[PDB]
C-alpha cells in the first residue's frame, strides 16, 4: 500500500521449503517416552539390571484378573517399597 | 566516479597535507578512510612562519584536510580507472 | 531518528539560547525531529517583543533553558 521492502527479502528459513520431514513424526513420538528411549545415547548396563517386569506391577492391577494375581501385584509392590 | 576510491588507491605515499587552519603536514599516508580521515606515519607538522614539530603517527580527520599535496611522480589516468 | 523528548517543556516559557550570542523567550507550542521550535512569541534579550508567534530553526539553537520549573 504505502511502502515496500526491497525484493529478495524472505523469511530467514524460507529457503528450505518443507517443515515436516519423513522422520519427524517418529522423532516427536520419541521425544515423549519413558527412559532408555528418549535419550538416544547412554551407557551399557549389566544384563540383570534391566527390570522388564517392574513397570507391569507398578501400574494398577486392571480388572478381569482373578484375585490370585492381584495378590501377586500386592506382594511385588511390597518388596519394591521395602 | 568516486575520488574516495582514488584516495584509497594512493597508499604509502610521502605527502604534504594542508588543513582548514593552514597547518602543513609532511607524512607517509599509510591509509585513508572512506570519509577522507588520513592516517599518516613519519609525520612532520609545520605552520604557514614558525618552528617545526615532528611526530611518529597522526590520524587527521577528513573534514579538516583542505588539500592533500600529492607526490612528485604519479600516473593519474591509471589511478582513475575502476 | 528518535524524537527530542521535549513533552516536559510543552506549554512552558523557555529561554532559547540561539546562535551568535543571542537569546529568545516564549511559551513552547511545538517541535520536530530536527529540533525546530514553534513557540508563542516573546522578546529578544533592554528588551522588545517581535511577532505574535515565532518559529526557530533547529540548527540555530544552542540551548533551550526552561524559565518555568
Amino acid at each position: 500500500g504505502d511502502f515496500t521492502l526491497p525484493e529478495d527479502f524472505a523469511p530467514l528459513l524460507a529457503e528450505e521449503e518443507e517443515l515436516i520431514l519423513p522422520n519427524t513424526k517418529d522423532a516427536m513420538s520419541l521425544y515423549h517416552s519413558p527412559f532408555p528411549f528418549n535419550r538416544t545415547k547412554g551407557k551399557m548396563v549389566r544384563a540383570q539390571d534391566v527390570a522388564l517386569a517392574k513397570k507391569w506391577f507398578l501400574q494398577h492391577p486392571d480388572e478381569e484378573y482373578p484375585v490370585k494375581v492381584k495378590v501377586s501385584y500386592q506382594k511385588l509392590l511390597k518388596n519394591y517399597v521395602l | 566516479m568516486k575520488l574516495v576510491n582514488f584516495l584509497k588507491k594512493l597508499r604509502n605515499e610521502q605527502v604534504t597535507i594542508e588543513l582548514k587552519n593552514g597547518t602543513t603536514v609532511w607524512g607517509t599516508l599509510q591509509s585513508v578512510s572512506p570519509q577522507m580521515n588520513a592516517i599518516l606515519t613519519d609525520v612532520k607538522l609545520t605552520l604557514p612562519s614558525d618552528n617545526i614539530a615532528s611526530l611518529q603517527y597522526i590520524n587527521i580527520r577528513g573534514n579538516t584536510i583542505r588539500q592533500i599535496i600529492l607526490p612528485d611522480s604519479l600516473n593519474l589516468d591509471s589511478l582513475l580507472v575502476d | 531518528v528518535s524524537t527530542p523528548e521535549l513533552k516536559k517543556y510543552m506549554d512552558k516559557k523557555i529561554l532559547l539560547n540561539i546562535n551568535g550570542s543571542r537569546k529568545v523567550a516564549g511559551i513552547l507550542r511545538g517541535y520536530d525531529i530536527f529540533l525546530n521550535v514553534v513557540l508563542d512569541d516573546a522578546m529578544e534579550i533592554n528588551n522588545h517583543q517581535l511577532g505574535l508567534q515565532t518559529v526557530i530553526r533547529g540548527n540555530s539553537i544552542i540551548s533551550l533553558e526552561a524559565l518555568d520549573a
Binding site: - | - | 531518528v1 527530542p4 521535549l6 540548527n59 540551548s63
Partner: protein, 82 residues
C-alpha cells in the same frame, strides 16, 4: 551503534559535566540523552567562558553545539564495554 552514545545514556542519573562550542561549561544530573547527544540536565550550574557562574534548573543542550562531556569515573568499571 556508537559506544560513546551508549556510555552517555548509561551516565543518565549521574552528575555529568558538559562544555559547548561557546565554551560554557555545565555540571548536572543527566536527565535524558539521545543518539544525537541531545542532553537534558537537572540542578545545573553554568560557567561563562570569561569566568562568572550562574545556577539554573533544567537545561537542555543539542549535541551539535556540545564539545565534550565528562562522565563520572565509576562508569569506567562496568558493564558496557565488556
Amino acid at each position: 551503534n556508537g559506544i560513546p552514545v551508549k556510555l552517555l545514556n548509561e551516565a543518565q542519573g549521574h552528575i555529568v559535566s558538559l562544555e559547548l562550542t561557546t565554551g560554557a561549561t555545565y555540571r548536572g544530573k543527566l536527565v535524558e540523552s539521545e543518539d544525537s547527544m541531545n542532553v537534558q540536565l537537572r540542578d545545573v550550574i553554568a560557567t561563562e567562558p570569561q569566568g562568572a557562574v550562574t545556577h539554573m534548573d533544567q537545561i537542555f543542550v543539542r549535541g551539535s553545539q556540545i564539545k565534550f562531556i565528562v562522565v563520572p569515573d565509576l562508569l569506567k568499571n562496568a558493564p558496557l564495554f565488556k
